[PDB]
Amino acid sequence: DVYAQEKQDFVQHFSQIVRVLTEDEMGHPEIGDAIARLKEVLEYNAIGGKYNRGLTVVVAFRELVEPRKQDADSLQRAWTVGWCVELLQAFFLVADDIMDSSLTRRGQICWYQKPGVGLDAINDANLLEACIYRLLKLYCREQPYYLNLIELFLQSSYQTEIGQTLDLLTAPQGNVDLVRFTEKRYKSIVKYKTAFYSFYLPIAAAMYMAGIDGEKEHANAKKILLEMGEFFQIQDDYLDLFGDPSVTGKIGTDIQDNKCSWLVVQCLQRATPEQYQILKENYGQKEAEKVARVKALYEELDLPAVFLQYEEDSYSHIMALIEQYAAPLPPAVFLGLARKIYK
Amino acid sequence: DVYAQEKQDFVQHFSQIVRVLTEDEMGHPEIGDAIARLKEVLEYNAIGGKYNRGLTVVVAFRELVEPRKQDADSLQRAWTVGWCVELLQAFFLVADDIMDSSLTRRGQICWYQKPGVGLDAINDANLLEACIYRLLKLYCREQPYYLNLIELFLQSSYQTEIGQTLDLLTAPQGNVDLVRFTEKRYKSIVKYKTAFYSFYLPIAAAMYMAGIDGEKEHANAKKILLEMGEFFQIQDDYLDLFGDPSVTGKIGTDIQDNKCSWLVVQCLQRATPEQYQILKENYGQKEAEKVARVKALYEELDLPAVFLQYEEDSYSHIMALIEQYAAPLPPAVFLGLARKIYK
Numbered sequence A, B: 001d002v003y004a005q006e007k008q009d010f011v012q013h014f015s016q017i018v019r020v021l022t023e024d025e026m027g028h029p030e031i032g033d034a035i036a037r038l039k040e041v042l043e044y045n046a047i048g049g050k051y052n053r054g055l056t057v058v059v060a061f062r063e064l065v066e067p068r069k070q071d072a073d074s075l076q077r078a079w080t081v082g083w084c085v086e087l088l089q090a091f092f093l094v095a096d097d098i099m100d101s102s103l104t105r106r107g108q109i110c111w112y113q114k115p116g117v118g119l120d121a122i123n124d125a126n127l128l129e130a131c132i133y134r135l136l137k138l139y140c141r142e143q144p145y146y147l148n149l150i151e152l153f154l155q156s157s158y159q160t161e162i163g164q165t166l167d168l169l170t171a172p173q174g175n176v177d178l179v180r181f182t183e184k185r186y187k188s189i190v191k192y193k194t195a196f197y198s199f200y201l202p203i204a205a206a207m208y209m210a211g212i213d214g215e216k217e218h219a220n221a222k223k224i225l226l227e228m229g230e231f232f233q234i235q236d237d238y239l240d241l242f243g244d245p246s247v248t249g250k251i252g253t254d255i256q257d258n259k260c261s262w263l264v265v266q267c268l269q270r271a272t273p274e275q276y277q278i279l280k281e282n283y284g285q286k287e288a289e290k291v292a293r294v295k296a297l298y299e300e301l302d303l304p305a306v307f308l309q310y311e312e313d314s315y316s317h318i319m320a321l322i323e324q325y326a327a328p329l330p331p332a333v334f335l336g337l338a339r340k341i342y343k
């Protein structure tokens, strides 16, 4: 709702983002071809998603900053920082798709799978990251929260990369051991690989723009946001297998990639010794028939019902956390976010 | 000389860099496996080179900062920033080796070619980059030049990535057109992909630590340093084919990769129509025999003599630039650097 009434404004300002990231180098004709490539990278990879993470920055900003302080300049900066969060995302996702050997994202073929792109997409990804800091300097350098934002974005990237490292270490290709796939290990992975950048980052950014820089306030917001992020990633794992491809926009690879998925973790907690063997002999392999066998095992253990039940309980737990930790922040800030990810 | 008498101190402090990048997360046991991987990545990729770029930060710092200001804390920060420059390098080189499909670097197999690593090396690279900003905050946050350094390192990364984009765009695999390989195009590529981070970055960092933040001083230093960087990359292209592998530490790939090399550019300027055809039909292809044919064409046009002559003239041109632009900085600063890269 508040998102949907912020969305189209947010999307419309992507053109100025691309304009300014392209004309920032007008005085340097010799890099024209690189700048054109950057434009193409932006348009293929930063556009086409739902922009929920970036919109969260905008929504939270309007709810945290007093209206008489929300001038045209301040709003412009708010949706610039929103787009920076979308760029960070794009940076990680382009690399993630290479490393997960994925095929599609946002209903199109992954950038690196495009003929002519391939592993050059690695440098494309790094450029998207650099754009974040080009925008922060262009729009926010003179602001009191400038350094806070730079550090928030750098820290969030480090955390996410630690998370990705845990994700990849725990999922060695060609090497199946289910013993690694524990609940404790799972929660650590998704905290770092998803929860920080998808949920803490956007709200924290808006907070700093609102002059809310207190360690206590950020720790309290973080209590709620990291838990939401844990649920969001469990939902991402569920949908990787049971989601509707025309809705998700991407083909799942967790089983083939031998991932420490929430699904496989719950399977391990429930499987008989016989079922364990079936999982062991079919998981982490590229063969369609072996993947289908894993999915059948999941459905036979009613993991879809287990997920639906977990989602209800997670929702309740998170609402409890909001009651406890939202103050002094407007509860609407966390509620709007909760509404976006729960049904 | 001044490098060699700074070197072993510099190298010895890598252990503290690795210590502090590993114990910075003592309070977070759950990421132990990621931190161990980071250590392994650091030790395989930041160690084993000559450290000239990092040593330049240290050397320049000692020459720019008054001795009575060079306390134990300030020196420690100087070789921390030196190591940050080495980490930036490692970040770019790990990715560069994937994208150039290289085999060896620093006398060992490329990180990504190691069994068990592969394209996970992409995330490894990003972690090395993040380490830069972790160190800057840990050691320099309270310093007046803190933000100047953060921005210098981010800007240098952006420039280098623009350069890499130009390098890759100009070298489409399977698509040979020699018409793209001009002198004008070449100079632009190496300015951005090498000159900024290898020569401006280190000196600029030391300058900012010395409180030298003037736009005029940096532009003058940059006049000298970008020209040195252009020569250094031409030398890198020369050695890719005519260098001694046990000295260079890496196998060349420029011809196979269809690169806009200084060699191919000079060849194009000199080749008869018949030789042009020979180049056209053998360049940018993986076949050893076709590569050998290109090398023979280069030697037949005495490109090695052309390089040796160019190196002498470049040296003289750069010394002229130092006479003109070094002041108010100690000329030794640029001379020591020139001495390292010329013979």
Ligand SMILES: O=P(O)(O)C(O)(Cn1ccnc1)P(=O)(O)O
Binding pocket: A092, A096, A100, A193, A194, A236, A237, A240
């Ligand atoms: O399941 P992943 O963690 O790989 C994913 O959720 C991406 N991601 C990467 C880091 N955090 C999330 P995606 O399913 O979009 O490919």
Ligand SMILES: O=P(O)(O)C(O)(Cn1ccnc1)P(=O)(O)O
Binding pocket: B092, B096, B100, B193, B194, B236, B237, B240
């Ligand atoms: O020749 P490249 O530019 O690929 C190289 O010099 C690396 N590099 C990358 C950007 N600047 C320099 P290397 O020969 O070390 O592989």
Ligand SMILES: [Zn+2]
Binding pocket: A096, A097, A100, A102
């Ligand atoms: Zn993925």
Ligand SMILES: [Zn+2]
Binding pocket: A096, A100, A167
């Ligand atoms: Zn992934």
Ligand SMILES: [Zn+2]
Binding pocket: A236, A237, A240
């Ligand atoms: Zn997923």
Ligand SMILES: [Zn+2]
Binding pocket: B096, B097, B100, B102
């Ligand atoms: Zn290379």
Ligand SMILES: [Zn+2]
Binding pocket: B096, B100, B167
């Ligand atoms: Zn290269």
Ligand SMILES: [Zn+2]
Binding pocket: B236, B237, B240
């Ligand atoms: Zn080279």
